[model samples]
Target: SGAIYVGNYRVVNRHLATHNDWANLVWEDSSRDLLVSSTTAQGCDTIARCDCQTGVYYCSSRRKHYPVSFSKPSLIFVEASEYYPARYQSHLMLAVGHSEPGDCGGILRCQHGVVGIVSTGGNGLVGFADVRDLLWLDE
Candidate 1:
């Protein structure tokens, strides 16, 4: 006795709640890569993996903020979908914002400085999560 296989793709959910909490999803991978997705429009959704040489890849409504947050993030890796292993590295830190005589609103790295920024006229405000290696919860 076995069950039928609908397709080759596998669906995974790290969190128990409905997958459509927001317009986007944010999460970290086992290798500590940061991934963001915009589910509303196709192809617009993005994935960012930390690359020691190229930096992180991201997308956002704000022209200034390259990456933005959508839902309460709980990234689950899909076996067949794009994204499997994480690949990115930062030693010092990351933060966002601009210096406006004490008014700052952005994300930047303390060590490197300016990993991402907070901007206007785009999507929503960007939220960042410090990387600390992916958790292993038995599937």
Candidate 2:
């Protein structure tokens, strides 16, 4: 197992195999200055980033990354949806649900159907033609 300290937490890759070659990863909350096990993922491709102060984890897929929010310094499994082909339907169809948590513990969807946004609180679904147009929490 390998671990990396982002800021207030350390991410440990459990290396458990899954359906899509994803591995189980663990997040250790370091806010308390203790190795507190916070969460795990059974099918996570990789962890892109983590917020120390907020205890939010940014887990990424092959093409996208979503946020996992923690209520306390406790371990919580992350649940994310897989990407589906944009069936040329209404751009609004790509709209992410409010229940879905990512980046900021909120839902953000794109109009191009190519990229999606994740935020806890912000404007409603914003449209973006390219992934480069997206912004992160710290940005």
Query: How good is model 1 by TM-score?
Result: 0.21
Q: Model 1 lDDT vs. the true structure? A: 0.25
Question: Candidate 1 — which residues are off by over 4 angstroms?
Answer: 1-40, 53-93, 96-127, 130-139
- Give the winner by lDDT: 1
- Per-model C-alpha lDDT, please? 0.25, 0.23
- Model 2: per-residue lDDT, tens digit, 42-97? 33222223222122222222234433322212222222223222222111111221
- What's model 2's lDDT at 42? 33
TM per candidate comes to: 0.21, 0.19
lDDT of 1 by residue, 94-127 (tens): 3232222111223322223223221111122322
Q: How many pairs collide in each candidate, listed in order?
A: 16, 5
Question: Candidate 2: where is the Cα deviation over 4 Å?
Answer: 1-11, 15-56, 75-139
After superposition of all CA atoms, the RMSD between model 2 and the true structure is 15.3
